[PDB]
Design a protein around this ligand. Sequence first.
Ligand SMILES: CCCCCCCCO[C@@H]1O[C@H](CO)[C@@H](O)[C@H](O)[C@H]1O
Ligand SMILES: CCCCCCCCO[C@@H]1O[C@H](CO)[C@@H](O)[C@H](O)[C@H]1O
Ligand SMILES: CCCCCCCCO[C@@H]1O[C@H](CO)[C@@H](O)[C@H](O)[C@H]1O
Ligand SMILES: CCCCCCCCO[C@@H]1O[C@H](CO)[C@@H](O)[C@H](O)[C@H]1O
Ligand SMILES: CCCCCCCCO[C@@H]1O[C@H](CO)[C@@H](O)[C@H](O)[C@H]1O
Ligand SMILES: CCCCCCCCO[C@@H]1O[C@H](CO)[C@@H](O)[C@H](O)[C@H]1O
Ligand SMILES: CCCCCCCCO[C@@H]1O[C@H](CO)[C@@H](O)[C@H](O)[C@H]1O
Ligand SMILES: CCCCCCCCO[C@@H]1O[C@H](CO)[C@@H](O)[C@H](O)[C@H]1O
Ligand SMILES: CCCCCCCCO[C@@H]1O[C@H](CO)[C@@H](O)[C@H](O)[C@H]1O
Ligand SMILES: CCCCCCCCCCCCC(=O)O
Ligand SMILES: CCCCCCCCCCCCC(=O)O
Ligand SMILES: CCCCCCCCCCCCC(=O)O
Lengths: 189, 189, 189
Amino acid sequence: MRLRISEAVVLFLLGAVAALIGDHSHVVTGTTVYHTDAVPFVWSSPFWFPILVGAATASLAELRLHLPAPRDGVTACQALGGVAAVVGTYVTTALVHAFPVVPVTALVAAAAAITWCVLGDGPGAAAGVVIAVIGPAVEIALVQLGVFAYHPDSDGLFGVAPFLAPLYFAFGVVAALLGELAVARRPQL
Amino acid sequence: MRLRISEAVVLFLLGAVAALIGDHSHVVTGTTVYHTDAVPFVWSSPFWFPILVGAATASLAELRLHLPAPRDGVTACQALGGVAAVVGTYVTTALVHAFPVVPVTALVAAAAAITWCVLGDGPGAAAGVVIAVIGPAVEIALVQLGVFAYHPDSDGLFGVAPFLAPLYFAFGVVAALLGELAVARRPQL
Amino acid sequence: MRLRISEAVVLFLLGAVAALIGDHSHVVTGTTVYHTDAVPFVWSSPFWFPILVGAATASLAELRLHLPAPRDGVTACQALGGVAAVVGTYVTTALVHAFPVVPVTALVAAAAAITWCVLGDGPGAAAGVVIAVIGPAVEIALVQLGVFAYHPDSDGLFGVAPFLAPLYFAFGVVAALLGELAVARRPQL
Ligand SMILES: CCCCCCCCO[C@@H]1O[C@H](CO)[C@@H](O)[C@H](O)[C@H]1O
Ligand SMILES: CCCCCCCCO[C@@H]1O[C@H](CO)[C@@H](O)[C@H](O)[C@H]1O
Ligand SMILES: CCCCCCCCO[C@@H]1O[C@H](CO)[C@@H](O)[C@H](O)[C@H]1O
Ligand SMILES: CCCCCCCCO[C@@H]1O[C@H](CO)[C@@H](O)[C@H](O)[C@H]1O
Ligand SMILES: CCCCCCCCO[C@@H]1O[C@H](CO)[C@@H](O)[C@H](O)[C@H]1O
Ligand SMILES: CCCCCCCCO[C@@H]1O[C@H](CO)[C@@H](O)[C@H](O)[C@H]1O
Ligand SMILES: CCCCCCCCO[C@@H]1O[C@H](CO)[C@@H](O)[C@H](O)[C@H]1O
Ligand SMILES: CCCCCCCCO[C@@H]1O[C@H](CO)[C@@H](O)[C@H](O)[C@H]1O
Ligand SMILES: CCCCCCCCO[C@@H]1O[C@H](CO)[C@@H](O)[C@H](O)[C@H]1O
Ligand SMILES: CCCCCCCCCCCCC(=O)O
Ligand SMILES: CCCCCCCCCCCCC(=O)O
Ligand SMILES: CCCCCCCCCCCCC(=O)O
C-alpha cells in the first residue's frame, strides 16, 4: 500500500476521534438511538463505530493515492480546515435534525459543496462519491438489522437521514486530501 | 445584450431551482405563508415566484457585464461555491427565523460579507446593492397587497424580514459572478 | 507603541460595536443575564463591557506587532471577512446555547479553526491563545462576583460557557490580523 503504517494509524485515530464526537452529538440530541446493549461502548458509541469510521478514513486516503496525480501542494492547514469543516457539518446535523428534511439536507449539501470547492479535486470528489454511496448503504443495513435507529423526523432515506449523502461525500473529499498530505509531508531534499 | 440567449436561460433555470428550494424551506418552516390560491403553484411556490427570481438572476448577471472590467479569471468552482453559499444562507434563514431579529440578521449579514470577501469585486457589490434594495421593495409591495405574509416574528422591515437585505445582497454578488463566468468560459484560442 | 493613536481608536470602536451586537444577542436569547443594575447600560450591556472588549481588540492588535514578522500582505477583505467570521460565530452561540455542550462547543471550535486556517499565522494563534485564557478567566471572576450569569445549560466551564475558549481564540486571531492591517495600509511609496 502507498500509505506507510504509521500514517494509516494516524488517519485511523483522527477519523475515530471525529466520529466519536459526531456520534455523541447525534445520540445526545436524539438524532439517533442505539439498540445494541450487548457490546462494549466507548463514550456514546458501540466500540466498533469509531473502528469503522477510522478504517474508512485510512482507506479513502489510500484510495486517493491510487487515483491520478495526487497533489503535492497540499498543506496542513488545508487538512485542518477540512477536518474542521466535516466535524462542524457533522455536529450541525445533530443541532438541526428535527427541522424539515429539505432545508436540513440542502444546508449539508451546501457545506459539502463549499468544502469540495475550496479543498477538493476531481479524484477527491470520486472518493467522496464512493463513500456517499457506501456509508449510507452500511447504515441502512444496520438500521434494518435493528442495531440503531434514526429519529422519526430524520429517517427519510430508507430508514436513515438524507443528509448522510452530502455528509459522507464531504468526509471522502477530506479523507482523500489527508492521503495526499501524508505523502506530501514526507521528508524532502 | 452581452449574455447569449443560451447562457441567460441556464442562469434563469439556476436561479429558479435555487429559489424553489429556498422558498419551499420558508413555507414548510412557517417563515412565510402564501395567500394567493387562484394561481398555479410549482412545489410550494406560486408559478411566478421562480420566474421572478430566475429573471433577476439572468438580469444581474447581464448588469455586471455592463460594469467596468468583468473578471476573466472566474472559475466554475467559485460559481458553484457562491451558489452553495447563497442557498445555504437562504435555507438557514428558514431554520432560524423564529429567533430574535438582531442575531438572525447579523448571522445573514456575516454570511453575505464573507461571500463577497471571498468571491466578489467592486462591481459585484454594486449589483448586490441594487437587488438588496429592489428585492425587499418588491416583497414589501407584495405583502401590502396581501399576496403572502411573513411570520410575525420575522416581519420587522415594513412587513418583511430584515435578513432579506443581506440575503439579496449575497444573491446579487453571486449572480454578477455567474455573468462573468458565462463570458469567461466561452471557447478560447 | 506601534499602533498610532488613530488606529488604536478605530480598532477600539470596531471591537466595541461587535461586542454590543454579540452581547445583545446573548442577553435577548437568554444565554446570559446581567445582575448589575447600578451602572449605566449601553443597549443591553453595562457600559464597561464594550470598553473592555474594545480595549482587548486594540491591545491584541498591538501585541501582534511585537511578535515576529507582521505580514505586510494583509488585505481589507481578509480583515472584513475575519470580523464577519467572529461576529457570525458570536451570534451563532446565542442561537444554539440551549443545545448539548459537546456539539455546541465543537461547532464553535470548528469555526475558530477554519478562521485561523484561512486568515491566521503562528503569532496570530499565539495572540488567540492569550485571550482564549484571559477572556474566560475574566468572565469566571465576574460571574463568581455575581455581576452576571450564564444560562444553566451553558455554564460548564466554572460558571461560564465552554464555547468561550474557541470564541475568544478566533477573536484574538482576527484582532492580530487587524493590527497587521493597520500598519500595512499606511501610505506607501
Ligand atoms: C495527514 C495527517 C497527518 C499524518 C502525519 C503523521 C504520519 C507520520 O508519518 C511519518 O512522519 C515522520 C515524522 O514527520 C516522517 O519521518 C515519515 O517520513 C512519515 O512517514
Ligand atoms: C471493524 C468492525 C468491527 C470489528 C469487530 C466486530 C464486532 C461486532 O460485534 C457485533 O456487534 C453487533 C452490534 O453491536 C451485535 O449485535 C453483535 O451481537 C456483536 O457480535
Ligand atoms: C470549507 C473548508 C475551509 C477550509 C479552510 C482552509 C483553507 C486553507 O487556506 C489556505 O491554506 C494554505 C495553508 O495554510 C495557506 O497557504 C493559505 O494561507 C490559506 O489561506
Ligand atoms: C455561468 C453558469 C454556467 C453557464 C454555462 C452554460 C451556458 C452555455 O453557453 C454556451 O456553452 C457552449 C458549450 O460550452 C459554448 O460553445 C458557447 O460558446 C457558450 O455560449
Ligand atoms: C414574470 C412574473 C409573472 C408573469 C405572469 C404574471 C402572473 C401574475 O398572476 C397574478 O398573480 C397574483 C398573485 O399570485 C394574483 O393575485 C393575480 O390574480 C394573478 O393574476
Ligand atoms: C463563502 C463562499 C465560499 C466559496 C468557495 C469557493 C472558493 C473557490 O476557491 C478556489 O476556487 C478556484 C476554482 O477551483 C481554485 O483555483 C482554487 O483551488 C479554490 O481554492
Ligand atoms: C485595520 C482596521 C482599519 C484601521 C484603519 C483606520 C486607521 C487610520 O490610520 C491612519 O489612516 C490615515 C488615512 O488612511 C493614514 O494617512 C495614516 O497613515 C494612518 O495611520
Ligand atoms: C475599562 C473597564 C471599566 C472602567 C470603568 C469601571 C467601572 C466599573 O463600575 C463597577 O461595575 C460593577 C459591575 O457593573 C459594579 O458592581 C460596581 O459597583 C461599579 O462601580
Ligand atoms: C472564515 C473566514 C473567511 C474570511 C474570508 C476572507 C478571505 C479573503 O479571501 C481573499 O482575500 C483577498 C482580499 O480581497 C483577495 O486577494 C482575494 O481575492 C480573496 O479571495
Ligand atoms: C475527516 C475526518 C472525519 C471523520 C468523521 C467522518 C464522519 C462520516 C459520517 C459518519 C456518520 C455516521 C452516522 O451519522 O451514523
Ligand atoms: C445564485 C442563485 C440564487 C438563487 C436564489 C436567490 C434568492 C434571493 C432571495 C429570494 C428571497 C425570496 C423570499 O424570502 O421571499
Ligand atoms: C474582531 C472583532 C470582534 C469583537 C468582539 C469580540 C468578542 C470576544 C468574545 C466576547 C464574549 C463576551 C461574553 O460571551 O460575555
